[PDB]
Amino acid sequence: DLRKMRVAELKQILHSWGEECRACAEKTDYVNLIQELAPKY
Amino acid sequence: DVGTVVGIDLGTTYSCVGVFKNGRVEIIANDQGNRITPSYVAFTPEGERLIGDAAKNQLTSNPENTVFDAKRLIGRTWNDPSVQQDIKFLPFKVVEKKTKPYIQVDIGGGQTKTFAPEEISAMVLTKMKETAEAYLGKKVTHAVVTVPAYFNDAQRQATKDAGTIAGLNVMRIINEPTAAAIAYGLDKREGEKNILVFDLGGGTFDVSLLTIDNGVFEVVATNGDTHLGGEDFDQRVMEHFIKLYKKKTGKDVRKDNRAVQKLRREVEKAKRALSSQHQARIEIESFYEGEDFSETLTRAKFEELNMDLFRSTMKPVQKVLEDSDLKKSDIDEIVLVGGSTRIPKIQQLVKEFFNGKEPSRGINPDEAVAYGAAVQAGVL
Numbered sequence A: 001d002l003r004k005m006r007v008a009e010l011k012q013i014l015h016s017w018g019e020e021c022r023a024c025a026e027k028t029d030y031v032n033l034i035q036e037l038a039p040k041y
Numbered sequence B: 001d002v003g004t005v006v007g008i009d010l011g012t013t014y015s016c017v018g019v020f021k022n023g024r025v026e027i028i029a030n031d032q033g034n035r036i037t038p039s040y041v042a043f044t045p046e047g048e049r050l051i052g053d054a055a056k057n058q059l060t061s062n063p064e065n066t067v068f069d070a071k072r073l074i075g076r077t078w079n080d081p082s083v084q085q086d087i088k089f090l091p092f093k094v095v096e097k098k099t100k101p102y103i104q105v106d107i108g109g110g111q112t113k114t115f116a117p118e119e120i121s122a123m124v125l126t127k128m129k130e131t132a133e134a135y136l137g138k139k140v141t142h143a144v145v146t147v148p149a150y151f152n153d154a155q156r157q158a159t160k161d162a163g164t165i166a167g168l169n170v171m172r173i174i175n176e177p178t179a180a181a182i183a184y185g186l187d188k189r190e191g192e193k194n195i196l197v198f199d200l201g202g203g204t205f206d207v208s209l210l211t212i213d214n215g216v217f218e219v220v221a222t223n224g225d226t227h228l229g230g231e232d233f234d235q236r237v238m239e240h241f242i243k244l245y246k247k248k249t250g251k252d253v254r255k256d257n258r259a260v261q262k263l264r265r266e267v268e269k270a271k272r273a274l275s276s277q278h279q280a281r282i283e284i285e286s287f288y289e290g291e292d293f294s295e296t297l298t299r300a301k302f303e304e305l306n307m308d309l310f311r312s313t314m315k316p317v318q319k320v321l322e323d324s325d326l327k328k329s330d331i332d333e334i335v336l337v338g339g340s341t342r343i344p345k346i347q348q349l350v351k352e353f354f355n356g357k358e359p360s361r362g363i364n365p366d367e368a369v370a371y372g373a374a375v376q377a378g379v380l
């Protein structure tokens, strides 16, 4: 699901929530943050 | 408030700390003036704890009480085939406790003590912390720490635990190849690229293929040799000179740790010198039985002694390209890590492998991982 998306799409999801991935070097970092934040949004 | 967050390369043989300020990273010299610090711990006979240069430099008849290479054990179980292999070449005692490898050493006073790998790495982190605090003129409480890409969850957690024991909140664990790429600003450029990180450290060799997609990395393929590094080149030179000295004097110095230590120190310096000179003179006053040692090493001889080891670095690179089905030409950036990458023959092998493409340059390869860590710490 998440792991299949492009980085631009992961960033799109986070931007739409007004959330930022601070000091997130790798795609896994974006995947992990979206999973943790998903029940909020 | 997390204060000034520093970047720390907690390395197998050497460690490095930097801080981001005024648009760049300052790699911080230790109190002996060195921008890298041996990942070493030892004890004086009187029971004083030495960490870093003092620990590595301390001449001893008892090598079994100097601790190093704890990174080889950190986060691993006793039954890990990697541990069972590694303990065979480590001079200090490693014992099972709590299904885990512990390190047993004499600490002075006819007392021994057993330490978890992460307690040894906490001591190294303490020294790097102190290094940073002396430069910054304030306490440091938070850090970004690097690990090898192949580290598992337990190994990453044990690294964080080393940080906790040292009084550091490790805010991010980041992979070494990614850190080196960040150092060179490769995340700030547009487009999709393939990055090959060629990392020949003091003790380990790591090749990592990274992609970048919209400023974000992915570690796609890794290979290397965990028992190939700069110390192996030094050992080839050691063997050459021990053999030469025995041929010349009839004296076999191998049983004599203090003489061996003295030679190893001078060989490390000679090796570094041969990256920029064609000859290096190794001179030790009172080397053995009060007799002096004086010999020269040419770059050609250095190359001859290590040619198989140098060439062996190209196989993992081929394996990573094959695994990813990438042409040589698909590699957009080559990032070199480790001072062994300054060895002219290693530069030439890499250049020839990649059809004359020039690697990234501008950052000391011994410092690049810390540099990247410090960049990432700079946004926290």
Ligand SMILES: [Cl-]
Residues within 6 Å of the ligand: B011, B012, B013, B014, B201, B202, B203
């Ligand atoms: Cl190292």
Ligand SMILES: [Mg+2]
Residues within 6 Å of the ligand: B011, B012, B176, B201, B369
């Ligand atoms: Mg390293």
